[PDB]
Amino acid sequence: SLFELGKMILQETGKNPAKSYGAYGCNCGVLGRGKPKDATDRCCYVHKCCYKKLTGCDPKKDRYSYSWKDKTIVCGENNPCLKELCECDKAVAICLRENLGTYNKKYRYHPFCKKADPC
Amino acid sequence: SLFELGKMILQETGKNPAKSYGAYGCNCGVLGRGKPKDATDRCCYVHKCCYKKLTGCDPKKDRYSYSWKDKTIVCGENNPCLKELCECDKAVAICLRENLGTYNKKYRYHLKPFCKKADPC
Ligand SMILES: C/C=C1/C[N@@+]2(C)[C@H]3C[C@@H]1[C@@](CO)(C(=O)OC)[C@@H]2Cc1c3n(C)c2c(OC)cccc12
Numbered sequence: 001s002l003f004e005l006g007k008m009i010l011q012e013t014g015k016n017p018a019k020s021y022g023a024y025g026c027n028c029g030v031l032g033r034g035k036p037k038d039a040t041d042r043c044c045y046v047h048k049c050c051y052k053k054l055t056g057c058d059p060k061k062d063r064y065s066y067s068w069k070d071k072t073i074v075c076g077e078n079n080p081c082l083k084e085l086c087e088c089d090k091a092v093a094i095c096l097r098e099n100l101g102t103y104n105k106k107y108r109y110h111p112f113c114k115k116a117d118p119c
Numbered sequence: 120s121l122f123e124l125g126k127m128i129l130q131e132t133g134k135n136p137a138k139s140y141g142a143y144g145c146n147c148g149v150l151g152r153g154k155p156k157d158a159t160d161r162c163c164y165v166h167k168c169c170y171k172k173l174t175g176c177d178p179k180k181d182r183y184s185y186s187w188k189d190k191t192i193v194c195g196e197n198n199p200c201l202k203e204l205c206e207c208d209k210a211v212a213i214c215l216r217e218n219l220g221t222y223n224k225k226y227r228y229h230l231k232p233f234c235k236k237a238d239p240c
Pocket of ligand 1: 120121124148149150151170171173174175176177178179180181200204
């Protein structure tokens with residue numbers, strides 16, 4: 001769910017997930033994927049691409065189990081798509097932390113971006 | 120792909136990428152991950168971990184056109200999935216060069232299985 005995803009971005013970056021990434025660029029947030037503005041936006045771009053190949057569960061409501069070992073996000077086996085769902089959030093949570101130096105506030109708030117290419 | 124990534128390794132390290140990093144340690148290779156045997160192995164370990172973040176990026180489309188300008192890899196592909204794939208290949212090529220001093224040919228080909236299980240990325 002958004003609880004797990006938010007906890008991941010918070011545990012990775014230490015930042016407010018809804019404040020920093022609730023409406024960042026043209027991929028972080030709602031309304032699908034658009035032409036990314038930076039690397040942080042590219043993370044949410046791949047994140048929603050990671051959601052398209054998800055079948056058997058809704059990424060926004062279905063709660064899953066993960067742990068925090070050795071300062072790493074460790075997904076619980078749970079169910080195949082739920083595991084793939086957990087990996088999508090973990091991937092972008094790691095991705096946003098690794099591009100946190102490229103973060104610019106001018107993109108913190110977003111149909112003005114070009115149509116997204118196929119994943 | 121392997122062609123672009125191989126080209127990057129040779130341009131940074133000056134070594135035949137298949138000979139030196141085709142089956143080195145537990146993570147250098149086109150197969151899988153394991154416990155890093157040394158620094159050069161972590162380059163490949165991080166490389167594989169970099170790959171796992173790309174799930175959803177069309178596995179068939181791995182060809183891209185990076186640039187070798189002023190002796191630096193430059194990923195300029197518009198496709199973000201190709202952009203991040205290029206950066207995954209770029210990062211390991213740099214890492215493989217930085218850890219050339221600690222390169223051990225003993226790990227180059229692993230005859231007996233000696234790989235522990237890979238810790239989570
Ligand atoms: C982007 C397209 C790709 C197509 N392919 C076959 C490439 C890169 C990525 C990847 C990585 O997971 C993928 O499916 O990402 C969505 C897969 C799996 C993969 C690739 N290499 C070059 C790999 C590699 O070389 C050292 C070693 C192990 C796995 C892969």
